[PDB]
Write an enzyme that holds these catalytic residues in place. Structure first.
Site, mmCIF file in Angstrom:
data_model
loop_
_atom_site.group_PDB
_atom_site.id
_atom_site.type_symbol
_atom_site.label_atom_id
_atom_site.label_comp_id
_atom_site.label_asym_id
_atom_site.label_seq_id
_atom_site.Cartn_x
_atom_site.Cartn_y
_atom_site.Cartn_z
ATOM 1 N N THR A 107 3.951 13.351 -15.285
ATOM 2 C CA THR A 107 3.247 13.630 -16.525
ATOM 3 C C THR A 107 3.434 15.048 -17.074
ATOM 4 O O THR A 107 3.389 15.231 -18.289
ATOM 5 C CB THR A 107 1.741 13.453 -16.431
ATOM 6 O OG1 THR A 107 1.417 12.231 -15.814
ATOM 7 C CG2 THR A 107 1.008 13.522 -17.770
ATOM 8 N N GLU A 144 -18.599 4.880 7.981
ATOM 9 C CA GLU A 144 -17.741 4.289 8.992
ATOM 10 C C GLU A 144 -16.258 4.433 8.726
ATOM 11 O O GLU A 144 -15.510 4.575 9.688
ATOM 12 C CB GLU A 144 -18.234 2.842 8.980
ATOM 13 C CG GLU A 144 -19.591 2.473 9.577
ATOM 14 C CD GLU A 144 -20.080 1.061 9.320
ATOM 15 O OE1 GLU A 144 -21.191 0.893 8.776
ATOM 16 O OE2 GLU A 144 -19.507 0.063 9.803
ATOM 17 N N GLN A 170 -11.427 8.620 -17.348
ATOM 18 C CA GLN A 170 -10.764 7.421 -17.826
ATOM 19 C C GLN A 170 -10.911 6.285 -16.824
ATOM 20 O O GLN A 170 -11.356 5.175 -17.135
ATOM 21 C CB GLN A 170 -9.334 7.772 -18.228
ATOM 22 C CG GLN A 170 -9.360 8.485 -19.581
ATOM 23 C CD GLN A 170 -8.020 8.350 -20.289
ATOM 24 O OE1 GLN A 170 -7.890 8.091 -21.480
ATOM 25 N NE2 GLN A 170 -6.960 8.851 -19.653
HETATM 26 N N1 LIG Z 1 -4.370 6.734 -13.120
HETATM 27 C C1 LIG Z 1 -4.494 7.526 -14.199
HETATM 28 N N2 LIG Z 1 -4.020 8.777 -14.097
HETATM 29 C C2 LIG Z 1 -4.280 9.448 -15.242
HETATM 30 C C3 LIG Z 1 -5.042 9.047 -16.311
HETATM 31 N N3 LIG Z 1 -5.118 10.049 -17.280
HETATM 32 C C4 LIG Z 1 -4.229 10.904 -16.859
HETATM 33 N N4 LIG Z 1 -3.762 10.662 -15.596
HETATM 34 C C5 LIG Z 1 -3.237 11.603 -14.578
HETATM 35 O O1 LIG Z 1 -4.063 12.710 -14.303
HETATM 36 C C6 LIG Z 1 -3.385 13.901 -14.624
HETATM 37 C C7 LIG Z 1 -3.690 14.397 -16.035
HETATM 38 O O2 LIG Z 1 -4.944 14.930 -16.360
HETATM 39 P P1 LIG Z 1 -5.198 16.329 -17.127
HETATM 40 O O3 LIG Z 1 -4.567 16.087 -18.438
HETATM 41 O O4 LIG Z 1 -4.631 17.410 -16.286
HETATM 42 O O5 LIG Z 1 -6.795 16.329 -17.360
HETATM 43 P P2 LIG Z 1 -7.807 17.458 -16.827
HETATM 44 O O6 LIG Z 1 -7.930 17.278 -15.368
HETATM 45 O O7 LIG Z 1 -9.085 17.307 -17.551
HETATM 46 O O8 LIG Z 1 -7.065 18.850 -17.187
HETATM 47 P P3 LIG Z 1 -7.525 19.482 -18.601
HETATM 48 O O9 LIG Z 1 -7.791 18.361 -19.537
HETATM 49 O O10 LIG Z 1 -6.459 20.449 -18.925
HETATM 50 O O11 LIG Z 1 -8.898 19.901 -18.266
HETATM 51 C C8 LIG Z 1 -1.890 13.679 -14.448
HETATM 52 O O12 LIG Z 1 -1.609 13.999 -13.106
HETATM 53 C C9 LIG Z 1 -1.852 12.195 -14.812
HETATM 54 O O13 LIG Z 1 -0.798 11.490 -14.196
HETATM 55 C C10 LIG Z 1 -5.719 7.806 -16.273
HETATM 56 O O14 LIG Z 1 -6.614 7.394 -17.000
HETATM 57 N N5 LIG Z 1 -5.293 7.027 -15.206
HETATM 58 N N1 LIG Z 2 -20.723 -11.923 17.686
HETATM 59 C C1 LIG Z 2 -21.248 -11.204 16.683
HETATM 60 N N2 LIG Z 2 -20.788 -9.966 16.491
HETATM 61 C C2 LIG Z 2 -21.092 -9.434 15.292
HETATM 62 C C3 LIG Z 2 -21.814 -10.040 14.289
HETATM 63 N N3 LIG Z 2 -21.867 -9.144 13.232
HETATM 64 C C4 LIG Z 2 -21.334 -8.026 13.645
HETATM 65 N N4 LIG Z 2 -20.758 -8.167 14.872
HETATM 66 C C5 LIG Z 2 -19.875 -7.258 15.641
HETATM 67 O O1 LIG Z 2 -20.519 -6.039 15.962
HETATM 68 C C6 LIG Z 2 -19.729 -4.925 15.643
HETATM 69 C C7 LIG Z 2 -20.347 -4.290 14.402
HETATM 70 O O2 LIG Z 2 -21.141 -3.158 14.683
HETATM 71 P P1 LIG Z 2 -22.478 -2.820 13.869
HETATM 72 O O3 LIG Z 2 -23.544 -3.756 14.325
HETATM 73 O O4 LIG Z 2 -22.056 -2.887 12.449
HETATM 74 O O5 LIG Z 2 -22.899 -1.336 14.323
HETATM 75 P P2 LIG Z 2 -24.411 -0.798 14.412
HETATM 76 O O6 LIG Z 2 -25.150 -1.337 13.248
HETATM 77 O O7 LIG Z 2 -24.238 0.663 14.263
HETATM 78 O O8 LIG Z 2 -25.037 -1.099 15.713
HETATM 79 C C8 LIG Z 2 -18.324 -5.507 15.510
HETATM 80 O O9 LIG Z 2 -17.830 -5.626 16.822
HETATM 81 C C9 LIG Z 2 -18.539 -6.921 14.990
HETATM 82 O O10 LIG Z 2 -17.584 -7.934 15.246
HETATM 83 C C10 LIG Z 2 -22.409 -11.292 14.580
HETATM 84 O O11 LIG Z 2 -23.254 -11.906 13.928
HETATM 85 N N5 LIG Z 2 -22.074 -11.876 15.790
#
Ligand SMILES: Nc1nc2c(ncn2[C@@H]2O[C@H](COP(=O)(O)OP(=O)(O)OP(=O)(O)O)[C@@H](O)[C@H]2O)c(=O)[nH]1
Ligand SMILES: Nc1nc2c(ncn2[C@@H]2O[C@H](COP(=O)(O)OP(=O)(O)O)[C@@H](O)[C@H]2O)c(=O)[nH]1
Ligand SMILES: Nc1nc2c(ncn2[C@@H]2O[C@H](COP(=O)(O)OP(=O)(O)O)[C@@H](O)[C@H]2O)c(=O)[nH]1
Ligand SMILES: [Mg+2]
EC number: 3.6.5.-
Lengths: 445, 451, 111
Positions: B179, B254, B15
């Site tokens: 539910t 990350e 859903q």
């Molecule tokens: N946020 C949200 N929660 C949902 C939705 N549908 C149901 N729920 C939640 O998910 C759970 C219900 O799902 P189930 O009816 O157990 O569905 P299922 O996992 O397929 O279990 P079976 O159908 O018996 O296979 C409950 O914990 C609900 O609160 C949805 O679309 N949105």
């Molecule tokens: N000053 C500066 N720092 C940056 C910029 N973009 C990313 N950073 C910094 O660098 C870090 C991000 O790490 P990142 O480069 O994503 O990691 P890596 O790709 O694994 O080396 C954080 O501290 C950011 O603030 C930029 O253009 N200028």
């Protein structure tokens, strides 16, 4: 894509079926010709769940019709929707049970059951994605009761892990429709309880009260009642048959409703119910649905739920809801009424919400509740049975169909055990089984 | 290149995936039948989103998605819905019977009948990732398949692909809303199985999002289509760095390296902002400070525990659209300087900041706020230990009485499984208590003077 | 890193008198920190008398952009201290303040 089979057993089990099947032909677009003429693509998408696709825009229902009298069978087929039931899906006797539960279970209905089982097999080998079986019936009757139980016990022998759902009428509270009700119902229970996953306890005087009270009709007949009930069996299977915000398979409600292996007798309910001269006035809202379904005097069942505590309750909605309000009305009604709830089963609710409403109407909901208050009905029927049985009343008729005195004594004992248990679930605390202890000595030698 | 693969597990996951995968088309111009309606380089170019789609034919897009519940009723809605002609027909996967809101049906019977068909289609998507990052699963802890299949998928993936990013995205237990009667059991048999696998798992609650919709957005009627069409923007704000260019972008690795002091403490709680009604958006100022204030507000949190009951360990606070690094530094320095907004004693460095140039974009079909900039936040905190304490409460009343356990027994499950999951909750309770403590040193016992 | 060392070499056989090495990187980064200190510590064994010089983004005192900054910075400085010749410390908390104070830039961008 998943498929249901249904059993229409005895007079009542079948008269309800004929109006159930009217309601469920209309929901899937299907004319009484046994062809579709409907109003949605989605009626056809899941026409398979109830029906077999026969050739050239032809549907027949997955219904099998079981009795030892032919009488209502003549009345189904000369009745509305008669032409749709395929001839080989009628399977009946011409001799009856004559109210005798035992003459169903042991004598005549037993001489028919294998020939039934053929029709059951023809159907079950043709729906690969077979999910479960249904029965409608009388509990106090001889036929729906005395044969439909052995049939269930031979369905459960052949289809061991599939769902078994059971839609009982119960014995009548203050006066009887059939004298032997307390023995039929109690014999029936000791076959049901080891072979069903869900059992629904409908009270015909609750439907007669509901009709004069909420629908405000003085003259409700079987058609008004057989429709009032069919919203529960429509309801419970809507979230399978149509899409939703919580779709729900039959097992998805049983596995929430049943906390222990014999604790599966339910009090049904429905909203909204409103007279023709007041449908203009009561509001079409989810707090009205919820407080109509949780009204103690809105239960379709012999018991006042303020006498018990709810173990579990499911609530199936239909129509287009705020899910926030579905949840917020469950939250409220449990905050307002917490003392009618088994407190070591915290949060007692299961919701399902189907997008597709009842015909030509904005919204509805279906209640399936597990109060302990249900013990009042099996208390009655055990105290009643006791008063026939410690005297040998009517007992010649059933021992006359070969039942040993141990069969009625095991049954009564079995019922009594279910009743003793229901007391042990009622008002219970989160206790942990300890006993009184006292201090020793510190003066070591 | 930088490929991700989503698995939509059970009715909630599904859903949600219908909301998400409206927006993942809509951000790029990609239509509801996979079409790029205008393409400046047919057979190459930009197309920065091959990270979310594989290309076919004359520049038709196929998404990198999977759908599974053992209910046709929720998958056929994908294959007959508004987007049927986008997805791949062997990526709308079913089973023969739905899981009844139960674990064991997943993990030992019927999920265990479909897991090897699913793992195989996942293997064909994975081999076509030239730069596979890893995979995300979308679920509810309270779900049936949600509990029963995620668990069995991540028991398979984490030793099929191993060092590849293992993620979850989970509906997390509501405090007062429920539910199903069986949610506490479904949650706790999955944490036992699957917390050994995810490197980070991202958390939201419906009881908070209903609050957001009723307060912030000022909606009278949250449907789940209203709810989930908010959540879209959470993963759209997480996934931006892989879909568009900017200034300080954040890979799916990350979050793990930064949100997780300890490899059991990897369940950070989301929030996203701004969120306003179509009246409010015309009187608000909506500068980076004022967003970042509303981002730490307790009411505004997407899991419904107040973060003030906890203490913060770590956090990740990514910015998207019209945003400036000095202006962001200024809002970080402000929430930091308000030490009353509470971190642990030991915290040297608690933050992870990002800049992506592409803005927030909404859906068709609402009275919605087309803002110029947004934040998406995840909080790691002991405040989750308040809702563990609730699972500790719910569980023990049911499990002592042994309510429901026979439904799990009869579909393939040990009794010791429940016990050993709650044992893990007995650990987790403390795994979260040995952190919320202040870094002060000492041991044993004394009663006399040194001086 | 070998595939780089090969390009660094192909550049070094383009230099008639190879001066040495400038770097721009981040100490709070992953790759700039970790794969740069890999490269710094490998150059030095291959280019012994040339200069190897660095312009590092360094962690700032009030805020932090990445949580593992103290690990990355300290693991970095361990290599840098004995395989380089200059370490220009560049800090965004000053760069942001120079842009705001001295240039009256209301909204300093990375540009
Ligand atoms: N946020 C949200 N929660 C949902 C939705 N549908 C149901 N729920 C939640 O998910 C759970 C219900 O799902 P189930 O009816 O157990 O569905 P299922 O996992 O397929 O279990 P079976 O159908 O018996 O296979 C409950 O914990 C609900 O609160 C949805 O679309 N949105
Ligand atoms: N000053 C500066 N720092 C940056 C910029 N973009 C990313 N950073 C910094 O660098 C870090 C991000 O790490 P990142 O480069 O994503 O990691 P890596 O790709 O694994 O080396 C954080 O501290 C950011 O603030 C930029 O253009 N200028
Ligand atoms: N609700 C309802 N109850 C009915 C109907 N017809 C009969 N019953 C009830 O069913 C019971 C009669 O049992 P019956 O079905 O005749 O026994 P059987 O045919 O031998 O199993 C009594 O309680 C009747 O009131 C019906 O269509 N609707
Ligand atoms: Mg499901």
């Amino acid at each position: 894509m998943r498929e249901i089979v249904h059993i229409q057993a005895g007079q009542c089990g079948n008269q309800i079926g004929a109006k159930f099947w009217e309601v469920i032909s209309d929901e899937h677009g299907i004319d009484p010709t046994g062809s579709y003429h409907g109003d949605s693509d989605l009626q056809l998408e899941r026409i398979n769940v109830y029906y077999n696709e026969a050739a050239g825009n032809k549907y027949v229902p997955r219904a099998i019709l079981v009795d030892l009298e032919p009488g209502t069978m003549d009345s189904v087929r000369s009745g509305p929707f008669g032409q749709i039931f395929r001839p080989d899906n009628f399977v009946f006797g011409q001799s009856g049970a004559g109210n005798n539960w035992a003459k169903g279970h042991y004598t005549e209905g037993a001489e028919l059951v294998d020939s039934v089982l053929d029709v059951v097999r023809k159907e079950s080998e043709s729906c690969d994605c077979l999910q479960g079986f249904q029965l409608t019936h009388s509990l106090g009757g001889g036929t729906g009761s005395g044969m439909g139980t052995l049939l269930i016990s031979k369905i459960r022998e052949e289809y061991p892990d599939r769902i078994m759902n059971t839609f009982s009428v119960v014995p009548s509270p203050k006066v009887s429709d059939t004298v032997v009700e307390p023995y039929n119902a109690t014999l029936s229970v000791h076959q049901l309880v080891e072979n069903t996953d869900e059992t629904y306890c409908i009270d015909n005087e609750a439907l007669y009260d509901i009709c004069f009270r909420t629908l405000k009709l003085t003259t409700p007949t079987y058609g008004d009642l057989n429709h009032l009930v069919s919203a529960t069996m429509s309801g419970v299977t809507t979230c399978l048959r149509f899409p939703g915000q919580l779709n729900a398979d039959l097992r998805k409600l049983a596995v929430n409703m049943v906390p222990f292996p014999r604790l599966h007798f339910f009090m049904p309910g429905f909203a909204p119910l409103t007279s023709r001269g007041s449908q203009q006035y009561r509001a079409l809202t989810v707090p009205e649905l919820t407080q109509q379904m949780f009204d103690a005097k809105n239960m379709m069942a012999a018991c006042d739920p303020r006498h018990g505590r709810y173990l579990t309750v499911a609530a199936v909605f239909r129509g287009r809801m705020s899910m926030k309000e579905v949840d917020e009305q469950m939250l409220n009604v449990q905050n307002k009424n917490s003392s009618y709830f088994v407190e070591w089963i915290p949060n007692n609710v299961k919701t399902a919400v189907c997008d597709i409403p009842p015909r030509g109407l904005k919204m509805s909901a279906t209640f399936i509740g597990n109060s302990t208050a249900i013990q009042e009905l099996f208390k009655r029927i055990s105290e009643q049975f006791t008063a026939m049985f410690r005297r040998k009343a009517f007992l010649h008729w059933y021992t006359g169909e070969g039942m040993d005195e141990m069969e009625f004594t095991e049954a009564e004992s079995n019922m009594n055990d279910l009743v003793s248990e229901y007391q042990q679930y009622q008002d219970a605390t989160a206790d942990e089984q300890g006993e009184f202890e006292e201090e020793g000595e510190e003066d070591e030698a | 290149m930088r490929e991700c693969i989503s698995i939509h597990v059970g009715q909630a996951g599904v859903q949600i995936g219908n909301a998400c995968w409206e927006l993942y088309c809509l951000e790029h111009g990609i239509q509801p039948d996979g079409q790029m309606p205008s393409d400046k380089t047919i057979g190459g170019g930009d197309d920065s989103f091959n990270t979310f789609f594989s290309e076919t034919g004359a520049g038709k897009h196929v998404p990198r998605a999977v759908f599974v519940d053992l209910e046709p009723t929720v998958i056929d809605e994908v294959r007959t819905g508004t987007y049927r002609q986008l997805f791949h027909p062997e990526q709308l996967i079913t089973g023969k019977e739905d899981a009844a809101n139960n674990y064991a049906r997943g993990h030992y019977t019927i999920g265990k009948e479909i897991i090897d068909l699913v793992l195989d289609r996942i293997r064909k998507l994975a081999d076509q990732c030239t730069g596979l990052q890893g995979f995300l699963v979308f679920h509810s802890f309270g779900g049936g398949t949600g509990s029963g299949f995620t668990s069995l998928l991540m028991e398979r993936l984490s030793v099929d692909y191993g060092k590849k990013s293992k993620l979850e995205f989970s509906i997390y237990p509501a405090p007062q809303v429920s539910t199903a009667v069986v949610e506490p059991y479904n949650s706790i048999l999955t944490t036992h199985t699957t917390l050994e696998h995810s490197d980070c798992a991202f958390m939201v609650d419906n009881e908070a999002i209903y609050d957001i919709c009723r307060r912030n957005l000022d909606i009278e009627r949250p449907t789940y289509t209203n709810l989930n069409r908010l959540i879209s923007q959470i993963v759209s704000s997480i996934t931006a760095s892989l879909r568009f260019d900017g200034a300080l972008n954040v890979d799916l690795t990350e979050f793990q390296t930064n949100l997780v002091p300890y490899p059991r403490i990897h369940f950070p709680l989301a929030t996203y902002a701004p969120v306003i009604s179509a009246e409010k958006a015309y009187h608000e100022q909506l500068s980076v400070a004022e967003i970042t204030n509303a981002c730490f507000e307790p009411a505004n949190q997407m899991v419904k525990c107040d973060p003030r009951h906890g203490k913060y360990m770590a956090c990740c606070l990514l910015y998207r659209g019209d945003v400036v690094p000095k202006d962001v530094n200024a809002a970080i320095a402000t929430i930091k300087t308000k030490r009353s907004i509470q971190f642990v004693d030991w915290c040297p460095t608690g933050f992870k900041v990002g800049i992506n140039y592409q803005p927030p974009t909404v859906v068709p079909g609402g009275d919605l706020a087309k803002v110029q900039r947004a934040v998406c936040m995840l909080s790691n905190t002991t405040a989750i230990a308040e809702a563990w304490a609730r699972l500790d409460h719910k569980f023990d009343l049911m499990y002592a009485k042994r309510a429901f356990v026979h439904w799990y027994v009869g579909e393939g499950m040990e009794e010791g499984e429940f016990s050993e999951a709650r044992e893990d909750m007995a650990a987790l309770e403390k795994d979260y208590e040995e952190v919320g403590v202040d870094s002060v040193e000492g041991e044993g016992e004394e009663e006399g003077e040194e001086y």
